[PDB]
Amino acid sequence: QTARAIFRFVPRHEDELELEVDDPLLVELQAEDYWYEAYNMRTGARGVFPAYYAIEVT
Amino acid sequence: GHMEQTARAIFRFVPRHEDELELEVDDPLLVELQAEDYWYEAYNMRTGARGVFPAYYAIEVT
Ligand SMILES: OC[C@H]1O[C@H](O[C@H]2O[C@H](CO)[C@@H](O)[C@H](O)[C@H]2O)[C@H](O)[C@@H](O)[C@@H]1O
């Protein structure tokens, strides 16, 4: 699934992904807690973030 | 200065990390914005829990 960061996200935890507004992401929703596992296509970084910081694109 | 403020959870937040604060929608919170990453240090006034959450998941009410 592809998505776009709708808000800036600065990690507090090492497993997290830094997001800038409008970063294109490849994304798997983790249904147990509504975090995304993500790849930031701008930065090449991989990590998790809380799902409400991005929206799915089609 | 980012002074303490009253807030409400606008989204459900389930921790992945031990230092995090569980939110339910419309939880009243006492909140101090941490400027280095825009996480809130927070007290959940419903649950009595202490912890951090990302700022987008609540709205200031003061
Ligand atoms: O006497 C302790 C400090 O009290 C104030 O700080 C608290 O209250 C503030 C106003 O609501 C908050 O912004 C802050 O988060 C609290 O620590 C005061 O501002 C400080 O100068 C005092 O040292």
Beta carbon of B6 within 6 Å of any ligand 1 atom: no
Cα separation of A21 and A23, whole Å?
Answer: 6
Residue A15, number of CB atoms within 10 A of its CB? 13
CA-wise closest residue to A16 among B43, A2, A43, B26 = A43
Which own/partner contact pairs does A51-56 have at CB distance under 8 Å and 24+ positions apart? A52/B11, A52/B56, A52/B57, A53/A5, A53/A6, A53/A7, A53/A9, A53/A19, A53/B54, A53/B56, A54/A3, A54/A4, A54/A5, A54/A6, A54/A19, A54/A25, A54/A27, A55/A3, A55/A4, A55/A6, A56/A1, A56/A2, A56/A3, A56/A27
Beta carbon of B20 within 6 Å of any ligand 1 atom: no
In order of start, what are the domains of chain A with their CATH numbers? 2-57 (2.30.30.40)
Cα separation of A16 and B48, whole Å?
Answer: 26
Size of interface A-B (CB pairs under 8 A): 36
The shares of helix, strand and coil residues in chain B, as percent rounded to the nearest 5, are: 5, 45, 50
Residues facing residue B6 across a β-bridge = B30
> How far does chain A reach from its first CA to its final CA, in angstroms?
9
Residues facing residue A24 across a β-bridge = A4
Cα separation of B5 and A50, whole Å?
Answer: 23
Instruction: Kindly determine whether residue B54 and residue A9, on different chains, have CB atoms separated by under 8 Å.
Output: yes
Which residues 1-30 of A have a C-beta within 8 angstroms of B?
Answer: 7-13, 15
What's this structure's resolution in Å? Answer: 2.0
Q: Helix, strand or coil for residue B6?
A: strand
**What single string gives the DSSP state of each residue in A5-44?**
ESS-B--SSTTB--B-TT-EEEEEEETTTTEEEEEETTT-
How were these coordinates obtained?
Answer: X-ray
Cα separation of B24 and A9, whole Å?
Answer: 20
B58 close to A51: Cβ distance less than 8 angstroms: no
Q: Which of B13, B36, B37 sits opposite A50 (nearest CB)?
A: B13
